[PDB]
Amino acid sequence: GAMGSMERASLIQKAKLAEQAERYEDMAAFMKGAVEKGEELSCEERNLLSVAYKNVVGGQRAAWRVLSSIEQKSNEEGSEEKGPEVREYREKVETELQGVCDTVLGLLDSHLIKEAGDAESRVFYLKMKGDYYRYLAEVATGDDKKRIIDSARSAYQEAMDISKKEMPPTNPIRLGLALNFSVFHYEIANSPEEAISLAKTTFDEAMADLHTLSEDSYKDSTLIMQLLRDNLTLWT
């Protein structure tokens, strides 16, 4: 790997610099290098990893949606034939997106998840596994579509089971996991009622635990609770 000659600490330092410079591809490459050193990741390091790839794949997903919409229009009644270019370029972006997802899933499988024993790390990584299979599912159209969806579901479900046993209802990792699993239900699994039930129960159980929290923890938790509420307002 091109980062094999750089110190772990230097990779982390440069990931933080890249973030400040909004250079998220660089940030992701630095954090990939840090993971490949083979040591477990601290809480701060896990979040650098997730921030970096979330931004990279987020831009790819937005580009894919633009191109897929152009492509769908070209296949409407009365649309002039324009050749293979739209499909080719949508395919190019799609392939790069899948490559990023595969890279993340590879890091999780070699060997972040198997070494993660604390709830905060294990739930975090299993949420990531669910998220990146969900991104694969968004672009999937072939024979593997159902297996991709079930891989997302299975990872989210393992993370939910651990989070409910090991974390309080206001824990921000637990809350963000539930938010994204509810999006999975609504957007991927064709299960809007499950999505709505999960978001509401998650919100209500967190609300009832806020009284235990400091001011700073209260701010962290209510921020994600508001995202649950925003989705419920969109979906109902």
Partner: peptide, 5 residues
Amino acid sequence: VNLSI
């Protein structure tokens, strides 16, 4: 769009 985090 759906909100995720």
